[PDB]
Structures are given as structure tokens and as C-alpha cells.
């Protein structure tokens with residue numbers, strides 16, 4: 002079955018494009034807005050509305066497959082592609098991509114996914130968000146053309162068993178790290194709460210005591226508010242590199258502080274994401290490795306998670322091959338085509354790496370819903386609740402699609 | 413085409429259920445919740461997780477139609493049904509509704525909508541939430557059965573033109589009445605921002621001076637933040653009956669105060685929702701009517717919107733026939749089956765009432781999306797960005813489905 006028509010429509014994503022460089026440089030705020038000038042190219046303000054381009058593929062049987070082109074919050078940075086402005090992309094996609102979609106067969110997914118993932122227009126690979134969104138629509142197209150769910154298509158093309166089982170979900174709080182923790186306990190969240198620990202003075206503390214107290218409050222809040230002791234979630238907190246900054250980038254000292262955090266967790270397993278940011282891929286790998294070695298040496302139970310500098314399928318391979326850390330964030334939109342997500346989760350699973358199928362608050366209901374199918378197939382150990390910073394909406398989108406899908410499969 | 417199988421799966425909706433008058437009474441606060449004793453039946457806490465029940469209808473052609481059972485935040489009051497918990501409704505659904513669904517013809521939508529809207533089980537009508545959800549899935553089923561969009565099915569069956577054109581959207585800030593305003597300006601929202609002006613002391617002011625100052629703040633923010641004068645949104649603020657409280661239900665005084673806000677809006681049109689709560693339908697209609705009369709007499713351009721006591725199709729008919737206000741909130745889940753939304757909006761449109769197709773923060777991505785199709789067909793004057801209180805997620809849901817659907821229709 003073929004695609005009869007391809008449509009591209011501008012839209013709003015579930016968060017904001019932020020100029021990471023200007024913010025790190027110390028941009029001030031006025032309400033929700035950041036002040037000063039942006040320094041990153043394409044930005045009209047330090048903070049701007051997040052945008053997406055919805056792809057709809059009307060098939061010969063009349064079904065309408067969907068996918069959303071979307072980029073991370075910090076669109077333009079850390080090895081991630083540029084400022085994804087949608088209006089500009091509509092004419093471009095209508096002109097160069099539409100004729101490559103209309104009349105295309107979608108009985109299978111992968112050959113199509115590979116094609117768009119490698120395509121250059123005037124020498125330039127397609128923007129990674131376009132690859133993300135097209136690939137979602139193509140997966141959905143294969144599903145709709147054959148009476149399968151997206152999950153089944155992946156299972157079939159990658160020859161996976163497709164045993165219907167929940168994926169642990171992870172909630173991110175943004176700066177609302179107290180109120181959102183309550184929300185997450187009320188809704189049974191498996192993993193929590195990110196906490197956006199992204200400033201040294203005000204969030205980590207110059208000697209780490211602020212984070213220490215935060216973990217204690219968090220575990221106390223969980224134990225106290227839970228309906229029963231059967232609720233025993235995992236703690237996952239992203240420190241956006243700040244721990245290296247207070248320990249002279251010495252991985253032994255970083256490890257030491259990290260281990261010291263376990264006590265405050267009160268039996269809840271603990272994960273610390275992005276402990277350091279050495280500023281380039283090779284050094285990031287090596288520092289994470291050295292931190293992991295010392296945690297082991299200490300007999301620590303605390304685990305660490307890579308994110309920055311770990312972007313593409315190949316990066317994920319590299320961090321994994323090096324034994325650098327216990328888990329890596331597969332930040333979905335930065336991989337491009339979603340077949341890359343499947344490939345990356347399987348590689349991790351084969352080689353011992355815990356795969357966290359993450360993403361961004363700045364993607365959509367469609368991209369998240371598509372990611373749910375990818376996860377139910379590939380079996381990562383953790384999935385980000387997304388998109389949005391409200392949390393409730395994200396949980397609604399990911400959790401309910403997961404459970405609907407498991408039921409359909411059990412049929 | 414018939415439905416082959418009906419599945420019902422538990423999920424989370426995008427907000428919380430709250431025992432109202434457990435709270436307004438004196439329920440304590442600790443972080444995100446309320447301490448102590450709920451007054452409302454079924455409730456294990458004064459606030460707990462909002463819930464839904466996803467209805468999935470697998471048809472003979474293998475398509476899967478979807479719809480979500482959901483209820484407002486304070487299920488329980490203003491003329492609303494009980495506590496919509498999944499563990500209760502899933503058995504009820506399997507016991508009493510599945511037998512009427514499996515094998516059912518879905519070639520049309522309206523018979524089925526009407527049939528379930530009237531159905532009695534042991535003498536009782538079905539819960540509005542159940543009727544809302546089934547009806548969404550039944551409309552989706554008719555669509556998927558015949559290669560139509562849900563919006564087209566409504567157009568076909570009520571004989572409407574379905575001109576592909578946008579509907580003005582309204583965002584709601586929840587208590588975050590400052591910060592969410594910046595979000596909305598940055599996303600160009602048509603109407604804003606609700607403001608949850610729901611307490612005399614802290615939000616409206618004993619003499620309405622706080623709301624007065626807020627309106628000026630809001631208009632200034634808009635005029636300051638916007639990128640050009642082309643952005644001229646409508647201001648829409650819900651004061652949840654507080655204006656009636658500080659004026660002792662004196663309607664001429666209410667009107668006078670409401671007219672004095674125009675000055676503060678600086679030329680942005682102003683809507684005040686729920687100015688009073690007379691605690692009963694017939695008094696509510698009378699009070700709103702006298703407020704409207706006095707506004708007109710003063711020559712004011714401020715309009716008022718009904719909400720509380722205007723629940724069902726028939727309520728809407730009654731508020732409309734009395735000429736009681738300029739706009740009514742058709743609070744979607746309370747009408748039961750969504751064909752009633754259609755009839756309500758058309759009724760308003762035919763009898764000089766502005767139809768505001770509302771809903772709640774506590775519904776779902778699926779209910780909202782389905783509400784988009786109802787609106788493109790019926791043409792209310794305004795539609796709520798929902799669900800959730802994060803705003804971004806809701807806009808993403810409602811605005812992107814709207815634009816995607818318009819693009820399909822133009823095909």
C-alpha cells in the first residue's frame with residue numbers, strides 16, 4: 002500500500018526553545034521570560050515558543066498516519082541540530098519531501114526509515130527533527146496499512162517477542178521540585194523526580210549539602226505520603242554537570258560525594274544523571290568511567306546516568322562499549338529516525354547497559370505516543386514521561402497509551 | 413460495520429479529583445495536598461489522582477476507535493455525578509455495556525449516541541463520564557468505519573458545511589496567573605487567561621480592587637510582551653462567584669463593578685465568567701439576567717459568561733431562552749454524550765448566545781482531541797485549551813489537532 006498524500010502543518014510543541022548558552026552565561030528573568038540578548042543563532046529571544054511540524058500521510062485505504070517533527074528544549078547545542086522553526090520548514094518539506102512520500106510503499110517501515118535518515122538536500126542531511134517526525138509517520142503508516150499496532154511492526158521487523166509488559170516511567174519536575182513530587186506520589190510514579198538540579202549555588206549547594214537535604218526531603222516525602230509500603234520507587238535526579246564543578250572535576254571526589262547520597266534515599270534506589278560535563282565526547286566517556294570505578298570501589302549502590310555528549314546511536318554505542326556508566330539517556334529526538342531508538346535500546350540490552358528511553362519536555366503528544374510503541378517493543382529499563390513540564394499531561398499521554406496498547410496486544 | 417470487541421482500561425486523567433467542601437471549609441495544606449477529612453463520597457483523600465477509563469472499540473475492519481471516560485475536578489457539586497473511579501467503572505462497563513457494544517453497527521453515530529444517552533441500568537442513567545467516553549468512541553468508530561474524519565461525520569449527520577476554519581482558543585492558567593500569562597502571550601493564544609480568581613481575600617479583593625489591579629497588569633503584560641499590535645486577544649477571567657459574595661448578590665452593584673473593569677483592559681475585549689453563584693438554577697438564571705440588563709443599560713462592552721448551574725443540554729437551552737448572559741460555558745463532560753455538545757452549540761448559535769465549548773483540566777488527550785472535531789463542525793465561538801493545568805500540553809493537543817484537521821478537510 003502506498004501513500005496517497007503527504008501533508009505538513011506547523012504547530013506548537015509542549016514547551017519552549019531555550020538558548021542554553023545565554024542562560025548559562027547568567028541571563029536574568031522577568032516572569033517566565035529570560036532577559037538580555039540571545040547568543041545562539043536563529044533565536045529571537047533567550048526563550049521562545051516550542052514549535053513542531055505535524056506530518057500526516059493519507060494512505061490508499063484512507064487511513065491517516067501521523068508523526069511530529071520536534072527538537073529538544075535546547076535546540077542548537079551539545080552536538081544537537083539547530084533552531085527548529087516550523088514555518089520556514091513547511092515550504093521546504095512541501096517542495097523536496099512531499100514528492101518523495103507520495104506514491105511510496107509502506108508495507109514495511111525500515112527501508113523507508115533508512116532512506117529519509119540518510120537523505121541530503123543541497124548537501125545537507127535532513128534536520129534531525131524532520132527525521133524524527135517523518136520516521137514516526139512512516140512507522141504509523143506501516144501499522145495502519147497492515148492492521149498492526151506500531152509496537153507490532155517494530156517487533157516484526159526486528160524479530161522481537163512482543164511480550165506485553167509495562168515499562169517503568171520516569172517523571173520530571175522541572176524547578177517545581179516539591180509540588181511535583183507530591184503529584185508523582187499521588188499517581189504512583191515508578192521513577193522520580195529529575196529535580197532540575199542545574200545551578201551550583203542555589204540547587205546543588207557549593208559543597209553539595211543542598212542536594213543532600215533535597216534527597217532526604219524527597220525520601221521522607223515518599224515514605225510519609227505513600228498509601229502503602231508497597232510503593233517503593235526509584236529516585237533519579239539530574240545534576241546537569243554541577244557535581245564536577247564543586248570537586249575540581251576530580252572523579253574520585255565526585256564519586257565520594259555521590260555515594261554519600263545513598264543514605265539519604267532510605268532504601269530507595271538512587272540514580273544521578275549527568276554528574277559531570279567534561280566538555281567534549283572523549284573526555285566525558287573517560288570521566289564517567291573513572292567515577293563509576295570509584296563507586297564500585299566504595300561498594301556504592303548509587304548509579305550514574307550519561308546524557309550530555311551521548312546523542313546519536315553511535316554515541317550510545319561508544320559510551321556503552323567503554324563501560325562508562327550504569328545507564329545512558331537515549332534522548333529520542335536527537336537520534337533522528339526512530340529506528341535508531343530501537344537499535345540503541347537493543348545494543349544496550351545485549352551488552353549490559355541500562356537503556357533509559359528519555360526525550361524532552363519540548364516534544365508532542367504524537368511523538369511521545371509513538372515512543373510508547375518503540376518502548377513496548379525494544380524494552381528499555383526506563384522511559385521519560387513526556388512531553389510538557391506539567392507532568393500530569395505527560396503521564397496521561399504515556400501511561401494510558403501504554404496500558405491501552407498492552408490490552409490490545411493481550412487480545 | 414460492527415464493533416467486534418470493546419476494551420476498557422484504567423488510566424490517569426490530566427489533573428486531580430478534589431473534595432470541594434472539605435477544602436473551602438478548612439482542609440489543611442502540606443506541600444501539594446490537603447490534610448484530613450474528605451466530605452465527598454468514595455474519596456480516599458481530599459485530593460487524589462484524577463482518573464479515566466479508556467474505551468477501545470476494535471471494529472471488523474481492524475481499526476481501533478477510542479474515547480475516554482472522564483469527569484470534572486470537583487466531581488460531586490453544581491449538579492454533577494459521583495466519584496469517577498476506574499476500579500468501579502470497569503466492572504460496570506464490562507457487566508452492563510460491553511453486551512450492548514460487541515456486535516453493534518457503527519455506520520451511523522447519532523442513534524448510538526442517543527441510545528446510550530438514554531439508557532437506564534436498574535432505573536438509573538449512566539454516569540455522565542461514561543456517556544462522554546462511549547460517545548467519543550462511537551463517533552470515532554463511525555469515522556474509522558467509513559474513511560471519514562470525526563468532524564465530517566458530525567457534519568454529515570447534522571447537515572453542516574464543515575468549512576475548514578479555525579476556532580478561537582482559550583487558555584487557563586490555574587493559580588499560576590502571572591507566569592502562564594507569559595506562556596500564552598509567547599504562544600499567541602486567542603483568549604486568556606482564566607486566572608482562577610477563586611477567593612475573595614487573596615484574589616478578587618473585599619472591594620474587587622485586587623482583580624482590578626490584575627486586569628491592568630494583564631493588559632499591560634500583553635501590550636508589553638507581544639511582538640506587534642496584530643496580537644489583540646480577548647481577556648476572559650473566571651471569578652467563581654466571588655463578585656456576588658462581595659456585593660451581597662446585588663446585581664446592579666455586580667454589573668457596575670464589572671463595567672468598571674473595562675477601563676483596565678485597555679481596549680482588549682473583556683469577559684467575566686461566573687460573576688455570581690446563586691446556588692440554584694432558577695435563581696442563577698435570574699441573577700445573570702439582571703446583571704446582563706444593567707450592563708447593557710450602562711452601555712458597557714464587558715460581557716459575562718455562565719458556568720455553574722448551566723450543566724446539561726436543557727440547562728443551556730434554558731439559560732439561552734432567558735437571554736441571561738452573553739456566553740455560556742458548555743462544560744463538555746457534564747453534557748454526557750457529545751452529540752449534546754453539538755446540539756447545544758447549534759442552539760446557542762441559533763438563539764443569539766455565544767457558545768463557549770469548555771471542559772475541564774481533569775479530562776484527557778483523547779477527550780480533548782475528540783472535542784476538537786465537535787467544534788470544527790458546530791462552530792462555537794470559543795473552545796477551552798485542555799486538558800491539564802500546564803497549558804503548553806493542552807495547546808499542543810488542541811491547536812495541533814485543529815490545524816491538522818483543517819488541512820485534511822482542505823484536501
Ligand SMILES: C[C@H](C(=O)O)[C@H](N)C(=O)O
Nearest residue numbers: 074239308360361362363
Ligand atoms: C529530560 C531532559 C533532561 O534534563 O535530561 C530535559 N529536562 C528536557 O525536557 O529536555
Ligand SMILES: C[C@H](C(=O)O)[C@H](N)C(=O)O
Nearest residue numbers: 485650719771772773774
Ligand atoms: C475550566 C473550569 C472552569 O473554571 O470553568 C475549571 N477550571 C476546570 O478546569 O475544570
Ligand SMILES: [Mg+2]
Nearest residue numbers: 239274275308
Ligand atoms: Mg539530563
Ligand SMILES: [Mg+2]
Nearest residue numbers: 650685686719
Ligand atoms: Mg468556570
